[PDB]
Design an enzyme around this catalytic site. Structure first.
Site, PDB file in Angstrom:
ATOM      1  N   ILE A 186       0.484  -1.274   0.325  1.00 18.37           N
ATOM      2  CA  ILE A 186      -0.132  -0.249  -0.228  1.00 18.37           C
ATOM      3  C   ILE A 186       0.970   1.376  -0.336  1.00 18.37           C
ATOM      4  O   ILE A 186       0.342   2.453  -0.460  1.00 18.37           O
ATOM      5  CB  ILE A 186      -0.712  -0.069   1.267  1.00 18.37           C
ATOM      6  N   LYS A 200       7.753   1.131   0.809  1.00 17.06           N
ATOM      7  CA  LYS A 200       7.451  -0.156   1.424  1.00 17.06           C
ATOM      8  C   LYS A 200       6.741  -0.584   3.136  1.00 17.06           C
ATOM      9  O   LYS A 200       7.127  -1.382   3.675  1.00 17.06           O
ATOM     10  CB  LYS A 200       9.182  -1.172   2.613  1.00 17.06           C
ATOM     11  N   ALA A 201       5.862   0.236   2.655  1.00 10.33           N
ATOM     12  CA  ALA A 201       4.018  -0.219   3.662  1.00 10.33           C
ATOM     13  C   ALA A 201       3.682  -1.181   2.922  1.00 10.33           C
ATOM     14  O   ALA A 201       3.100  -1.217   1.261  1.00 10.33           O
ATOM     15  CB  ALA A 201       3.452   0.840   4.127  1.00 10.33           C
ATOM     16  N   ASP A 247       6.805  14.387   7.717  1.00  9.28           N
ATOM     17  CA  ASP A 247       6.324  13.385   6.751  1.00  9.28           C
ATOM     18  C   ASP A 247       4.499  13.872   7.162  1.00  9.28           C
ATOM     19  O   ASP A 247       3.856  13.177   7.389  1.00  9.28           O
ATOM     20  CB  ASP A 247       6.241  12.248   6.968  1.00  9.28           C
ATOM     21  N   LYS A 294       5.132  -0.985   8.207  1.00 12.37           N
ATOM     22  CA  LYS A 294       6.772  -0.611   7.687  1.00 12.37           C
ATOM     23  C   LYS A 294       7.910  -1.368   8.079  1.00 12.37           C
ATOM     24  O   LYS A 294       8.334  -1.872   8.850  1.00 12.37           O
ATOM     25  CB  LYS A 294       6.477   0.752   8.119  1.00 12.37           C
TER      26      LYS A 294
HETATM   27  C1  LIG Z   1       1.545   3.864   8.018  1.00 10.08           C
HETATM   28  C2  LIG Z   1       1.542   4.025   6.460  1.00 10.08           C
HETATM   29  N1  LIG Z   1       1.934   3.730   5.548  1.00 10.08           N
HETATM   30  C3  LIG Z   1       1.270   3.662   4.213  1.00 10.08           C
HETATM   31  N2  LIG Z   1       2.254   3.732   3.291  1.00 10.08           N
HETATM   32  S1  LIG Z   1      -0.166   3.225   3.780  1.00 10.08           S
HETATM   33  C4  LIG Z   1      -0.563   3.098   5.969  1.00 10.08           C
HETATM   34  C5  LIG Z   1      -1.037   3.569   6.561  1.00 10.08           C
HETATM   35  C6  LIG Z   1      -1.049   3.280   8.029  1.00 10.08           C
HETATM   36  C7  LIG Z   1      -2.541   3.375   8.672  1.00 10.08           C
HETATM   37  N3  LIG Z   1      -3.953   2.213   8.050  1.00 10.08           N
HETATM   38  C8  LIG Z   1      -3.502   3.309   6.664  1.00 10.08           C
HETATM   39  N4  LIG Z   1      -5.362   3.124   6.373  1.00 10.08           N
HETATM   40  C9  LIG Z   1      -5.216   2.862   4.148  1.00 10.08           C
HETATM   41  C10 LIG Z   1      -6.474   2.322   4.466  1.00 10.08           C
HETATM   42  C11 LIG Z   1      -7.112   2.881   2.795  1.00 10.08           C
HETATM   43  C12 LIG Z   1      -5.663   3.071   1.634  1.00 10.08           C
HETATM   44  C13 LIG Z   1      -4.426   3.313   2.375  1.00 10.08           C
HETATM   45  N5  LIG Z   1      -4.038   3.710   1.428  1.00 10.08           N
HETATM   46  O1  LIG Z   1      -2.723   5.449   2.131  1.00 10.08           O
HETATM   47  O2  LIG Z   1      -3.821   4.726  -0.003  1.00 10.08           O
HETATM   48  C14 LIG Z   1      -4.291   3.796   3.923  1.00 10.08           C
HETATM   49  N6  LIG Z   1      -2.590   3.040   6.308  1.00 10.08           N
END
Ligand SMILES: Cc1nc(N)sc1-c1ccnc(Nc2cccc([N+](=O)[O-])c2)n1
Ligand SMILES: Cc1nc(N)sc1-c1ccnc(Nc2cccc([N+](=O)[O-])c2)n1
Ligand SMILES: [Cl-]
Ligand SMILES: [Cl-]
Ligand SMILES: [Cl-]
Lengths: 295, 290
Positions: free
Chosen positions: B22, B23-24, B134, B39
């Site tokens: 979604i 390096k996450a 960030d 992460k």
């Molecule tokens: C910390 C973090 N880094 C990302 N890259 S995504 C992410 C994160 C942390 C907690 N929750 C979410 N939810 C989420 C749900 C759906 C879509 C996306 N998105 O960043 O396209 C994120 N994303």
């Protein structure tokens, strides 16, 4: 000397005592070994004694530009010297050879896209460094792009130009390699930074297909094919991003081709830059320095 | 061992299955199927210095707890990487939420309720003398119940200005402060500039500073010139936007000063209990001494 080439007309220039032993021609270009420590270098020899006053002042200007250029993806200049009616430029030897040879060594097996792109981004970074300083490179060719022992790509420095004549470029191409000739040069229009971009496109196409984009059974028909802008399409297994970039570099009108800065701003290229340049170099060359035709 | 070290860390047996980048990485627990985000940081190719600083960063992340910061669950180390597990915010990021308006401007009350939550999170980080590199709409998330959470990953104990500029020329450049554009020190007020960019995105659905090149973007940011916010927004809100985009860092308000403005202050009670208000605003002291 009761005269009617006067003696003492030979130019002498040197910056160090280091001596080089000729090993082999490699293309112009000679492979040498230092007698100091046995390290290998490449020397390019240019005849000077049969140049005018003007042409010598322009060659001197070119070498000074070469001598000051420093970038991780440009072949590193060591020194120059003049003796016996020639100018000699010493540079680092790239142990992996030229891209031309590397392409032929595939023996028809196509490169992976990630390899094509990692090489390509490095060539773009080098060309950015040159173009930011308003310098044209007359010699973006796979035979003038080299690989170091650790696989780093280096653009040959030799070939940079402060200005280029279209008739002379066209003539050079009949005689040497014609595969990088842009449409505008074919029509006797000014050589410009987008003519370098066309040559960059030729190199990219070689990397995608292992062949030249514009080939023909005669020089005269090669010229007509280049102006028509028609080339065999790249394999469809390559991404849309890559195939589309190839098409953009081969736009007939120079002003429709992207600048190297614009190529490097495309997402699938931009995400690779970080592998190749330090934060300091990224900041300095993309953000902090200013470049202009105004001085 | 006749010649001519990998660390292992874990705090629980819970195992995670990779679902998707979604390096996450989006993962599911094999325990109860709950979703989390992980992460991954490569550690094995860092120096001594850089590893000591990453360890220091993770310890800071691991101790941070606030209702408006993404909740850290655990971390583990294996195979030359460090992994940080956090809660999955089901509502996604504010970047997507902004685009989903498809040009329809948000109500001022919705902007301000989100903004106060971002400010409370940033107060919690700044009070402890921590910088956040960030503050971006792509790193602010909505939970299933609509609570705003600032992403924790991105906190920093110190930031190098050249490195920040480089990162921006490669990733997202829209949050770059004038001082970083001029290669001057990153500081808490640089975070305040980025907070202003987020607020502006919420007010206009667009970035404040866009341009046809990275170089010209830099010049526009330094000039400080941006398209004005819609005049149907209150004077309070429009004036706040202008203060966060002050060219000189020291002329931007602190996050504590932002929270003290009446039209923001009256919303704080919806988001924090009395105990937390007393603790965050009145009792717990932090100082560069310690
Ligand atoms: C910390 C973090 N880094 C990302 N890259 S995504 C992410 C994160 C942390 C907690 N929750 C979410 N939810 C989420 C749900 C759906 C879509 C996306 N998105 O960043 O396209 C994120 N994303
Ligand atoms: C600048 C240059 N001009 C040449 N001609 S060769 C050359 C050069 C410069 C630096 N390194 C190398 N390496 C190298 C090694 C092996 C083979 C070839 N080659 O041109 O076939 C080149 N070649
Ligand atoms: Cl260009
Ligand atoms: Cl200041
Ligand atoms: Cl602050």
């Amino acid at each position: 000397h009761h005269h009617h080439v006067d003696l003492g007309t030979e130019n002498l220039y040197f910056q160090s005592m280091e001596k080089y032993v000729r090993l082999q021609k490699i293309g112009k270009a000679i492979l040498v070994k230092s007698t100091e420590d046995g390290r290998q270098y490449v020397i390019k020899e240019i005849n000077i004694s049969r140049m005018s006053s003007k042409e010598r002042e322009e060659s001197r200007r070119e070498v000074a530009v070469l001598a000051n250029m420093k970038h991780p993806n440009i072949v590193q200049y060591r020194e120059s010297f003049e003796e016996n009616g020639s100018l000699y430029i010493v540079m680092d030897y790239c142990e992996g050879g030229d891209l031309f040879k590397r392409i032929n060594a595939q023996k028809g097996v196509l490169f992976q896209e990630d390899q094509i792109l990692d090489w390509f981004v490095q060539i773009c970074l080098a060309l950015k460094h040159v173009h930011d300083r308003k310098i044209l490179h007359r010699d973006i060719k796979s035979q003038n792009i080299f690989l170091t022992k650790d696989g780093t790509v280096q653009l040959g420095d030799f070939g940079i130009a402060r200005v280029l004549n279209s008739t002379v470029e066209l003539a050079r191409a009949c005689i040497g390699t014609p595969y990088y000739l842009s449409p505008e040069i074919c029509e006797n229009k000014p050589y410009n930074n987008k003519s370098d971009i066309w040559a960059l496109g030729c190199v990219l196409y070689e990397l995608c297909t292992l062949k030249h984009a514009f080939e023909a059974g005669s020089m005269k028909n090669l010229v007509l094919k280049i102006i028509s802008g028609s080339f065999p399409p790249v394999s469809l297994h390559y991404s849309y991003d890559l195939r589309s970039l190839v098409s953009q570099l081969f736009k007939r009108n120079p002003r429709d081709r992207p600048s190297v800065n614009s190529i490097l701003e495309k997402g699938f290229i931009a995400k690779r830059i970080e592998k190749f340049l330090s934060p300091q170099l990224i900041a300095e060359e993309f953000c902090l320095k200013t470049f202009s035709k105004f001085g």
